[PDB]
Amino acid sequence: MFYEIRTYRLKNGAIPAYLKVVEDEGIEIQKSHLGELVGYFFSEIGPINEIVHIWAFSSLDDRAERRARLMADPRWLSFLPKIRDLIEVAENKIMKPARFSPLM
Amino acid sequence: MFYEIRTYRLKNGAIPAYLKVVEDEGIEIQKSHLGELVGYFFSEIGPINEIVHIWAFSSLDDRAERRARLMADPRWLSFLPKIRDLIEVAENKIMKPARFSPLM
Amino acid sequence: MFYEIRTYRLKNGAIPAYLKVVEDEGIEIQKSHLGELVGYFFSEIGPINEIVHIWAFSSLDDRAERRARLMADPRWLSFLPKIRDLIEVAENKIMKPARFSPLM
Amino acid sequence: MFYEIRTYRLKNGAIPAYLKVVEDEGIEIQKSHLGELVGYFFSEIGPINEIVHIWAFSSLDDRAERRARLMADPRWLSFLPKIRDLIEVAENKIMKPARFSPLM
Amino acid sequence: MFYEIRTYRLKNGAIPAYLKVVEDEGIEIQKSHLGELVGYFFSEIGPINEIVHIWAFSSLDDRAERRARLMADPRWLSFLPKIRDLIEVAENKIMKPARFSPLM
Amino acid sequence: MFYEIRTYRLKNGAIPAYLKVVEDEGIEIQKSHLGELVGYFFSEIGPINEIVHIWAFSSLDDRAERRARLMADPRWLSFLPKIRDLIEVAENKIMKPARFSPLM
Amino acid sequence: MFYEIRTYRLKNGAIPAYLKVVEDEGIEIQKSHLGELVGYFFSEIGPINEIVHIWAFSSLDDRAERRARLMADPRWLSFLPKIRDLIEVAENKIMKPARFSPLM
Amino acid sequence: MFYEIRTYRLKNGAIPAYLKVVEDEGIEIQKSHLGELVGYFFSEIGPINEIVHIWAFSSLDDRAERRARLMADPRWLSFLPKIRDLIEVAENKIMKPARFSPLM
Numbered sequence: 001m002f003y004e005i006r007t008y009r010l011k012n013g014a015i016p017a018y019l020k021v022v023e024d025e026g027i028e029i030q031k032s033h034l035g036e037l038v039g040y041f042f043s044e045i046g047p048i049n050e051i052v053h054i055w056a057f058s059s060l061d062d063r064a065e066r067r068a069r070l071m072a073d074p075r076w077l078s079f080l081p082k083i084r085d086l087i088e089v090a091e092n093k094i095m096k097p098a099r100f101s102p103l104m
Numbered sequence: 105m106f107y108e109i110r111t112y113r114l115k116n117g118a119i120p121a122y123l124k125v126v127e128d129e130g131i132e133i134q135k136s137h138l139g140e141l142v143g144y145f146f147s148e149i150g151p152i153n154e155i156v157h158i159w160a161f162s163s164l165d166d167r168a169e170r171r172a173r174l175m176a177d178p179r180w181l182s183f184l185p186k187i188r189d190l191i192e193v194a195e196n197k198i199m200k201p202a203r204f205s206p207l208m
Numbered sequence: 209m210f211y212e213i214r215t216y217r218l219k220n221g222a223i224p225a226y227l228k229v230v231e232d233e234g235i236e237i238q239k240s241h242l243g244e245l246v247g248y249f250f251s252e253i254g255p256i257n258e259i260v261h262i263w264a265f266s267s268l269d270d271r272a273e274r275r276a277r278l279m280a281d282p283r284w285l286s287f288l289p290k291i292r293d294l295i296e297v298a299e300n301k302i303m304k305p306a307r308f309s310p311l312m
Numbered sequence: 313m314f315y316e317i318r319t320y321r322l323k324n325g326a327i328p329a330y331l332k333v334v335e336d337e338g339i340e341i342q343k344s345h346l347g348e349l350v351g352y353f354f355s356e357i358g359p360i361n362e363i364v365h366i367w368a369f370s371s372l373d374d375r376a377e378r379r380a381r382l383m384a385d386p387r388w389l390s391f392l393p394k395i396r397d398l399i400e401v402a403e404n405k406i407m408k409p410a411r412f413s414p415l416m
Numbered sequence: 417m418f419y420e421i422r423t424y425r426l427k428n429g430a431i432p433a434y435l436k437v438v439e440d441e442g443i444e445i446q447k448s449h450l451g452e453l454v455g456y457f458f459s460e461i462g463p464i465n466e467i468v469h470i471w472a473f474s475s476l477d478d479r480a481e482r483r484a485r486l487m488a489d490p491r492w493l494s495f496l497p498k499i500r501d502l503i504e505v506a507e508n509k510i511m512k513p514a515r516f517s518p519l520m
Numbered sequence: 521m522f523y524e525i526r527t528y529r530l531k532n533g534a535i536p537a538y539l540k541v542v543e544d545e546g547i548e549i550q551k552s553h554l555g556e557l558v559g560y561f562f563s564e565i566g567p568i569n570e571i572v573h574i575w576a577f578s579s580l581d582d583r584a585e586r587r588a589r590l591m592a593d594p595r596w597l598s599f600l601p602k603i604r605d606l607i608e609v610a611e612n613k614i615m616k617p618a619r620f621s622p623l624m
Numbered sequence: 625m626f627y628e629i630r631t632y633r634l635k636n637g638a639i640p641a642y643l644k645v646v647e648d649e650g651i652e653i654q655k656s657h658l659g660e661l662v663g664y665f666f667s668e669i670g671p672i673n674e675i676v677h678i679w680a681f682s683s684l685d686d687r688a689e690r691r692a693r694l695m696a697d698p699r700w701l702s703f704l705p706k707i708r709d710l711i712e713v714a715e716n717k718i719m720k721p722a723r724f725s726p727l728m
Numbered sequence: 729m730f731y732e733i734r735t736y737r738l739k740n741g742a743i744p745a746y747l748k749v750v751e752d753e754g755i756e757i758q759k760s761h762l763g764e765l766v767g768y769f770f771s772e773i774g775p776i777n778e779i780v781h782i783w784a785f786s787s788l789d790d791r792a793e794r795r796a797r798l799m800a801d802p803r804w805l806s807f808l809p810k811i812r813d814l815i816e817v818a819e820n821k822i823m824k825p826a827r828f829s830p831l832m
Contacts (some may be wrong), residue, residue: 044200104147256335404773460614511561532812533813715774726767
C-alpha cells in the first residue's frame with residue numbers, strides 16, 4: 001500500500017476554523033473519493049498552526065485516478081475556497097509501510 | 105489521544121539495514137513498552153532516506169512513564185547501538201486527532 | 209521540570225506593537241494560568257522580528273491542564289486577536305534541564 | 313541585560329555523554345568566566361539531540377571580554393576536545409528581555 | 417551549455433491561474449528572448465504550489481544579455497504584474513550538464 | 521508524462537568522483553531500466569556539491585515497476601556502494617509538465 | 625573590527641522600489657549614524673528578492689550606541705514605514721575578518 | 729560589477745585550522761587568479777562554524793574564465809585537500825551592488 005502524507009502550515013490561528021469547515025463540508029466528500037483516511041492531526045507541540053493528514057492508496061495510478069475524480073467534483077470545487085486562504089505553505093510525500101507496520 | 109510523530113533522516117542507503125534490525129531486534133521490545141504503534145513508514149517519493157513512525161499515548165505523562173521504562177530496559181540499551189549511527193538527524197512532535205480522524 | 213520554548217516570527221516591524229499589547233493585556237492573564245514564566249525575549253542579533261519565551265511545567269499533563277484553562281479564559285480569547293495577525297510563523301518545543309542548570 | 317542563546321545539534325545519541333563531561337569538566341570553568349548561566353536544556357519533544365543554553369551579559373563588549381578570557385583558559389582548551397566532535401551543527405543569537413520578563 | 421533552474425513557491429492555490437496567464441501572455445515573449453526552454457513543471461508530489469522551469473544558455477554573459485533584453489521588453493513589463501503577486505518565494509541556480517546528460 | 525526530479529547533496533568535493541563512476545558504471549544500467557533521462561546536472565552557482573537529474577515516466581505505477589526492476593538488477597546493487605557514501609542528503613519529487621513545456 | 629551582515633527577503637518584485645527609497649531617503653541618514661557601509665547588494669543568481677548589506681563596527685557596544693542614535697533619529701522613524709512592508713523576512717549576524725581579509 | 733558570496737559551514741571547531749591553512753597556502757594562489765577579494769569573514773554571533781568570503785568580477789564569463797584557471801593550477805589542486813574535509817556544507821550566490829554601494 002502507498003501512504004501519502006500531506007503537511008500544511010496555516011495562517012496563524014486558523015486551525016479551529018479550518019478543522020470546522022473541513023469537518024462540516026470537506027472531509028466526507030474527500031473520503032468518498034480518496035478511499036482510506038489513515039489519520040488527520042493538528043499541532044500541539046512542535047510546528048505550530050500545522051495540519052497533517054495521511055491517506056492510503058493501493059497504487060499510485062489509483063491515487064491519480066481518485067484525485068482526478070475528487071478534483072472534478074463540483075462540490076469539492078465549491079469547498080476549496082473555504083480553506084484555500086487558510087493554508088499558507090504545503091507539501092506532500094509518498095511513503096511505504098515497514099513490514100512490521102500495522103498500516104500495510 | 106496524543107500522537108507522537110518521529111521523523112529520522114538516515115545515512116544515505118541505510119534504510120534497508122535499519123528496517124531489518126528494527127524488525128529483528130527493536131520493534132517488539134519497543135511495542136511492549138510504548139503501547140500502540142500507529143504506523144511505521146520509509147520514504148518513496150519526497151525526502152529520501154527517511155523514516156517516519158507514529159505512536160499514540162493516552163496522556164503525555166503516560167508517554168513519559170512508558171518511555172522511561174523503555175529507556176531502562178537493558179535489552180533496549182543493547183539494541184540502540186545498532187541504529188544509533190544509522191540515524192543522522194531526528195525530531196519528534198506531538199499532535200492531536202481531528203474529531204473526524206479514524207485515529208482518536 | 210519541563211521547559212516549553214515558544215519561538216515566533218512576527219510581521220516585519222511588529223515587535224514593538226506586539227510587546228506593548230502583551231505587556232498591557234496578555235502577560236498577566238497568561239501568567240495567572242501558566243504558572244512560571246522563565247524568560248521572554250525579542251531579537252537583537254540573529255533572526256529578526258523574533259520572539260522567544262520560556263515556561264516551566266511540573267508535568268506535561270499539568271501543562272495541558274493549565275493551557276486548557278488559559279484557552280477557556282474569555283479574557284484570553286478577547287486578547288488573542290490583538291497578536292494573532294502580528295505572528296506569521298510559530299513553533300514550540302519541550303526540553304528538560306541539565307543537572308547543572310539553574311533552571312530545574 | 314543581553315541574553316545569548318546557543319543551540320547545538322549533537323551526533324545522534326550523544327546527549328548523555330555530552331552532558332556528563334560538561335557537568336564533570338566544563339560548566340564550572342565556563343561559569344567562572346561567563347558569569348550568569350540562565351538555563352541549560354536538552355531536547356525532549358521537538359528537535360532531537362539538541363542542546364540549548366542561555367547566558368546573560370551586562371554588555372556585549374563585556375561578553376567579548378569574558379569569552380576571550382574563557383578561550384584563553386588552558387583548562388577550557390583541554391576540555392573543548394571532549395565535546396568538539398559531539399557537536400555537529402551550532403549557532404548562537406543575542407536577544408533582549410521584554411520589560412515584563414523575569415529575566416532582565 | 418549552462419542550465420538555469422528557477423523554482424518558485426506560489427500563493428496556495430495559484431498554480432492554475434499562474435500557468436494560464438503564463439501560457440496566454442508570457443511564455444512566448446519570454447522564449448523569443450531567452451532562447452531555449454528545457455522544461456516547465458508544476459508540483460504533484462513533494463513541495464506543493466511549486467513551479468520549476470529550466471532554461472539553457474550558451475554562456476552566462478549571453479544569459480545576462482538575453483535577460484536584459486527581456487527586462488526591457490515593455491510587453492514583458494506589462495505581463496509581470498500578472499504573476500508578481502502569485503509568486504511568494506523564489507530562487508534560481510546555474511548548473512552544468514554531465515557528459516552523459518542528453519542536455520548538453 | 522510524469523517528471524521525477526532527484527536532488528542530492530554530496531560530500532564536499534565528491535562531484536568529480538561521483539560523475540566519473542556514474543558515467544562509467546551506473547548511468548547505462550539505470551537508463552536501460554528507467555527509460556528516459558531528461559537531464560543530469562551538477563552545481564555551478566547556488567547550492568554547492570549538488571547533483572540534479574530528471575527522469576520522465578508515463579505513469580507512476582510504471583515508475584514503480586521500472587524502479588523495482590532496477591533495484592533487482594544485481595549489477596545495480598554492485599554499483600550502488602560506489603556512490604552510497606558520496607551522497608550525504610537526498611530527496612526526490614514528482615512534477616507535471618505545463619501545456620507549454622517542451623517536456624510533456 | 626566587527627562586521628554585521630543583514631539579509632532581507634523582500635516581497636516578490638519589491639527590490640526596485642526598495643532600492644529607490646533607500647537611496648533617496650534612508651542610506652544617508654543611516655550612514656551618518658552607523659559609520660562605515662562595507663557593501664550593499666541585491667540578488668541576481670541564488671535567493672531571489674534578496675538584499676544583503678554589510679556594516680563595520682569598532683566594537684559591539686559602539687554598534688549598540690550608534691544603532692540607538694539611529695533609532696532615535698525622527699528622520700529615520702519617518703523613513704522606516706517606507707520599507708517596513710517591503711521586507712518579509714530578515715536576520716543579521718556578526719562576523720570577524722580573517723587576518724588576510726582586506727576588510728579588517 | 730558582480731559580487732560572488734560563498735558561505736561554508738565547517739566541521740565543528742575547524743575554523744582556526746581552516747583559516748591557518750588558507751592564509752598559509754591558499755589565499756595568495758586564489759587571489760592571483762580570481763582578482764579582487766572583497767572580504768573574508770568567520771562567525772562570531774549567528775551561524776557557528778561559518779565562513780563567508782566575497783569576490784568581485786567584471787563579468788560572469790570573466791569569473792568562469794578566472795575560476796577555470798584557478799582550478800587548473802596544480803598548486804590549487806595540491807591545496808584543496810587541506811580544506812576539502814573541513815567544509816561540510818557550502819553554497820554561493822551572485823549579487824549586484826546598489827547604486828549607493830561603496831562596492832560597485
